[PDB]
Each structure stands twice: as C-alpha cells, then as structure tokens.
Amino acid sequence: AGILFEDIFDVKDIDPEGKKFDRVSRLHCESESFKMDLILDVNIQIYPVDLGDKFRLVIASTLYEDGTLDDGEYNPTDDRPSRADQFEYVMYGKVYRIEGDETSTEAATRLSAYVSYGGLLMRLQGDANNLHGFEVDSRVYLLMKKLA
Amino acid sequence: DGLAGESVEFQNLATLKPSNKAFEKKFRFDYTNERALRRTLQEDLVKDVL
Amino acid sequence: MNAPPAFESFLLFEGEKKITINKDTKVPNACLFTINKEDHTLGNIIKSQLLKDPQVLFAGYKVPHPLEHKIIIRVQTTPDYSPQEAFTNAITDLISELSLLEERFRVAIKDKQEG
Amino acid sequence: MIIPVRCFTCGKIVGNKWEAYLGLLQAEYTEGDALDALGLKRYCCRRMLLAHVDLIEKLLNYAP
Amino acid sequence: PYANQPTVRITELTDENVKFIIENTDLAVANSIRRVFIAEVPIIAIDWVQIDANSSVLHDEFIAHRLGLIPLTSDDIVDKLQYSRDCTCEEFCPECSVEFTLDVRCNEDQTRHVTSRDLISNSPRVIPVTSDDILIVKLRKGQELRLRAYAKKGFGKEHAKWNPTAGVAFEYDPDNALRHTVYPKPEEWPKSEYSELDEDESQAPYDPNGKPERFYYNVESCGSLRPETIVLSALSGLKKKLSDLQTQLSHEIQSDV
Ligand SMILES: [Zn+2]
Ligand SMILES: [Zn+2]
Numbered sequence: 001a002g003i004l005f006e007d008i009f010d011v012k013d014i015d016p017e018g019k020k021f022d023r024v025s026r027l028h029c030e031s032e033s034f035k036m037d038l039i040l041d042v043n044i045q046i047y048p049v050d051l052g053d054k055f056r057l058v059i060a061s062t063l064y065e066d067g068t069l070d071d072g073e074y075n076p077t078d079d080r081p082s083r084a085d086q087f088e089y090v091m092y093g094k095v096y097r098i099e100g101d102e103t104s105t106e107a108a109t110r111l112s113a114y115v116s117y118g119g120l121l122m123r124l125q126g127d128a129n130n131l132h133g134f135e136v137d138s139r140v141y142l143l144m145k146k147l148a
Numbered sequence: 149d150g151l152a153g154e155s156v157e158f159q160n161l162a163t164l165k166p167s168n169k170a171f172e173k174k175f176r177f178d179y180t181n182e183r184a185l186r187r188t189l190q191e192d193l194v195k196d197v198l
Numbered sequence: 199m200n201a202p203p204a205f206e207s208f209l210l211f212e213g214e215k216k217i218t219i220n221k222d223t224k225v226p227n228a229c230l231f232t233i234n235k236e237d238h239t240l241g242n243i244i245k246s247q248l249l250k251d252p253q254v255l256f257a258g259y260k261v262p263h264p265l266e267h268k269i270i271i272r273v274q275t276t277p278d279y280s281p282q283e284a285f286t287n288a289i290t291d292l293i294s295e296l297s298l299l300e301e302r303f304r305v306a307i308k309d310k311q312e313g
Numbered sequence: 314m315i316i317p318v319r320c321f322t323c324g325k326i327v328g329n330k331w332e333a334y335l336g337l338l339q340a341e342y343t344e345g346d347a348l349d350a351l352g353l354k355r356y357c358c359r360r361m362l363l364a365h366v367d368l369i370e371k372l373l374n375y376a377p
Numbered sequence: 378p379y380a381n382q383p384t385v386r387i388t389e390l391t392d393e394n395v396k397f398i399i400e401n402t403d404l405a406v407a408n409s410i411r412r413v414f415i416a417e418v419p420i421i422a423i424d425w426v427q428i429d430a431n432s433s434v435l436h437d438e439f440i441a442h443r444l445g446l447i448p449l450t451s452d453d454i455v456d457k458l459q460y461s462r463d464c465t466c467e468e469f470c471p472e473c474s475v476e477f478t479l480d481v482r483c484n485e486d487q488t489r490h491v492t493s494r495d496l497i498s499n500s501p502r503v504i505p506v507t508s509d510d511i512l513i514v515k516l517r518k519g520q521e522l523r524l525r526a527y528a529k530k531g532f533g534k535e536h537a538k539w540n541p542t543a544g545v546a547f548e549y550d551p552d553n554a555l556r557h558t559v560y561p562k563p564e565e566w567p568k569s570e571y572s573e574l575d576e577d578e579s580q581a582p583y584d585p586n587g588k589p590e591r592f593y594y595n596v597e598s599c600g601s602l603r604p605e606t607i608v609l610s611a612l613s614g615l616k617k618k619l620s621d622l623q624t625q626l627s628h629e630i631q632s633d634v
Contacts, residue, residue: 022559044586045583071291076255077252077253077255104183104184104187105179105181105183105184105187107187203573204534204535204536205535207534208534208535208537209462215625216621216622216625217625217626218629219633220629229434230556231626233622236622238409238412238471239409239412239615239618240409240618240619240622242405242408242409243403243405243406243409243619245378245405246400246403246406247379247403247405249380251379258583260521261518279488282626282630285626286623286627287378287501288631289619289622289623289626290623291379291380292378292380292381292619293619293620293623293631294380294617295378295380295381295383295402296612296619297616298380298382298383298614299383299399299402300609300612300613300616301384302383302384303385303397303519303608303609303612304609306385306386306387307387307390307395307605307609309387310387310390314434314435315435315512315514315515316444318443318446318447318511319446319599320543323543323544324537324540324542324543324544324599325543325597326448326506326511326542326600327545327601328443328446328447328511328512329492329493329507329509329511329512330509331512332509332512333509336590350394352437355544356631357544368434369434369515370515372434373434373488373515373516373517376519377432377517377519377520
C-alpha cells in the first residue's frame, strides 16, 4: 500500500549539539524492532516532543492508500480517505541521497537514506533489507504519531 | 586559447594533485576483477569487456 | 514638475474601467481581476473573505507598483465553481459583515450614551 | 516660524496650544507637567510643541 | 455565505476619542477599517484660498496652508454636501462648498493674533472646531490680512487636511498567543494596557491553532467629526465602496457573456 518503511522509534536525544533553531529541533532516535537510527528535524511550536517519547514512523510514498501517484500538488479540497487521518504529524519531502557501505566487490549492507522535507532534513540508517523503497529523487511522505 | 572571458568557469583538475598510487587506483580502468566490473556494468557489457 | 495630481489615486477619468476580467491560461478555472484606482484597503478584505470560501483554492492580490494605482486579484476555485461567482460571493459577504458591524456599533453607541 | 497647526505625525491639533503652553511655563510649571496638562500624551505631539521656536515673534520686530 | 458575525463592545466614549473592541473578525477587515478611519472618511476643509491683501510676515502660500489644516465642524452637513467635481455648478456653489471670509487689520500697539475665530463662514453648520483658538498668524501694527476661502469635501487619500482622526491606535493579541512578533527577550517588554497576565508571566503561551480574533481600537478625533460619527462614516464608506465594486463587477460579467 505504498508503505516504504514502518517502525516505532524512541527519542534518545534532542539537539545534542545545541538549540540551532528556535522552531525546529533535531531528534536523535533509535528503534528496537529493526534496530535502525533516525535523525529527524521536526517543528516544535506546532508539535512538541520530549526526550524518551515513543512515536511511529510510517514513511510512505502515497497517502491515498491506492498506489495512485499524487504528483505533488496541494489539493485541500479532496474527500477520499487519505492516510493522513490516523497520524498527527504529516510531512512531505524528497529523498535526495542514499548512502551505503558498498565496496568495489561486495553489495550494500548498511544503507543511509537522506530525505529533505522542504528544508527539515532526516537521515535513516539501517540494514539494507528495509531501505529498498527509498530511491534518489523520489517524493515521499513522513507520518508520525506518539504512542501513550 | 581563443575563448572569451565571459563563458569560462573555475574548475579543478583531478589529475595534477593525486599521487601515483592514488592516480592509478582512481583513473586506471580494471578488468581483472570480475565482481566489481559486474557490479558497475551490465552482464552483456561485462561479457564484451572480458 | 512631475508631481501627479493627488486625486488620481481614487478617480477614474475617461478611458479606464473600474474592473476587468482576464482568464488565466496557466491553470484551469482562474481569473485575474484587475481593479483600477484602488489600493490595499479593498484588496486585503477581498483576499481574506475569499480565503474562507472552501471552494477557493487560490486567492491573492498584488499592487504592481505603489505609484501606479491598480490592484490585481488572482482567484482560482474548484472546477465546479466559477471564480467570478467566488468574487461576487466574497463581496456580498463583506457587505453583510459591514452592515452587521455598523448596526451593532450603532446599538453599542446608543447603549453607552444612555448608560 | 510659527507653531504648526497640526502635529506632523498623527495630525492632532497643536496650533491652539502654543499660547497656553507659554502661559503654563510662565506659571512655574516644568515642561513635562505643562505638556501633560495640555493633553499631549503621545510623544509625537510632545516633540511638536516642545521643540518649536517662535521665530515669528522676532520677525514682528521689523517695521512693515 | 461565509460572512463573519462581528461583535462590538465600547469601552470609552468621550468627545475626543472612542475606545472600542471588535470580536470575531478577520485581521484584514479590522485593518481595512483602520485604514478607512485614517484616509476614507469625508470631512470639510478649506481648499481654495484667494488672498486680497497680505501684509503679514508670512507669505500667501503659508497662510493658505495653515488655513487648509484648520479642522471644520462636519457633523451632519458632510453627508448632504456633494463633491465639487460631481456638482453641476461652474466653479463653486452652496450645495458643494462652504464660503469663509477672514478680514483682520492690526492698528493697536500690541500684537494681534489672527486666530481661527476670525474665520467668518456664511453657513452656520460649518465653523472652526475652536468655537483656545487655533493661531493662524500674528500681526504687527499696520499689517492686514484679508482673504476669502472655499471649503470642499474630501477624504484623507487626497490630502492630510481631510484626515478626521488624530491617531488611530490599533492593537490585536496584546499577549503573544499567536507569536506574530517574536521577542528576543520577552521579560524586557512592557505589558500592553489590554494585557491579561500577572507580573510573573511575560507573554501568553503559544496557541498553535489561533487566529487574530479580538481587535482593540482607539479612534481619536481631531475635531471635525465626533468619534462615533467617524466610525459610522467609515463603515458606511467601506460598504459603499464594496457595493460600487460589486455593481461594476456585475456590469463586467454581463458584458463578458
Ligand atoms: Zn502627534
Ligand atoms: Zn456646486
């Protein structure tokens, strides 16, 4: 259903290097199911987060749960039941670079996916088995909801 | 050179600085290593090269 | 020497029209209302009233030059709703707003004066 | 040369307050209290009436 | 139909200023009401000065300028008076202008103060508001000022002489619940007179889903109009402008089809 990545993350640290920007904070987070690692810049005025909070990332290529390409135009007058109803923080961005651990001979084994959400950047490191839907210059959505 | 000054840019020559080992490593095409050449190229292309 | 007369900021002399309609060919169902001899006073309220209308996708205004007296309001609406209808509805709603505010202000003034 | 009719900034009438201000000053009122008693609250009008020079008084010394 | 339902509460009402509050309104509507207060409320001011004799120390243009800025009472006659441009008369007439006459001659030893009280007007409803008086010019013995003026109807967009207000204090969201302005050091800033916080607090907590809803006004009248009449005329004038725009839009739509 277009769900490129799915996991629950723990906020291990917030702004380790300092409060770089007032309204945006950098979360250093670590999962436990797939044991990945997510640096993520989030807005704080509209959506505060605290250290040691559980939140679910459902990073997906489409909110319309049909596979139909959205094409990236703002359509506020849409009634179909998009995926942005069960999550309280939705973001849009471009996967602008995919790093890895490739040698000359061996294939990738630990991939990094870099996604820029209009300026708010995110790095997702993990095993290459999970980061296959990510492609360079691919437009993706990031979905977040905190867990009680 | 024959070139107007309004269309030239600043560029870096990638051959002047590197040492002999690094230059040979990063500029000499290798074909003995089948795995790497297969990773970079397609199957038909590597077959033709070898 | 070249100082314009002060009254040209709000007066139409023979040759110009207060409002004109120009379809925008870049996107479907969009209009460029060009209003002469107005300023931000009637631009801001129209934009704000259009922004409330859920069938209006885009609503902006600009003043191409502070020395030229002309505003350009761009409106793009849903396929099932004409931009001209959106403009007319916005003006009607603004007029209703102002009438209601005037009536309530008069009532409040009467109450304060009485006691 | 003469007191402006209106404050340049806001447009409050201050042309009628120059003589009253001078009279208050002659009544051993400090400038701040004199300005306050005349209703000038915003500092633009206080600027207007405090910084004025009555040059017309000197211009009237010459015969017509 | 998505028009608002604005509400008005009046806090203060004197002969000089009106302090009121508008609730449930767009920021744009409140701002446009303020701009109409300043610049689109018609009043009557001197705009045509003809000077017969002027022996004062002030040249003719200076006297004309200071005459134009004298506020004139425009309570009820401004509605019944037409603009000079739209009137059918040739140059000026009682239906579209008010005639003023000034005639002062100083022959006493002490200085004579040509004030606004010397502006004699044929129409009894239009007089200088000071009737201390506004000083027009000081005159030495032997100097005379004799002129006749005509006062038109106009609004502040043309000239500041037709501005009826004397500073429209407009405010909204006195505590930064909306964070429309970001204080680098909030503790240093004085609290607004409409604030609703105790001494310990510096600004209200951020409101992520808030919009400007309450607007505090203080319309101070120069004297030409009562402040309540300034606000009423402003609202009526904005309504009239919008209705005229609607009429022109209707004509254009009918012509395009
Ligand atoms: Zn002032
Ligand atoms: Zn006439």
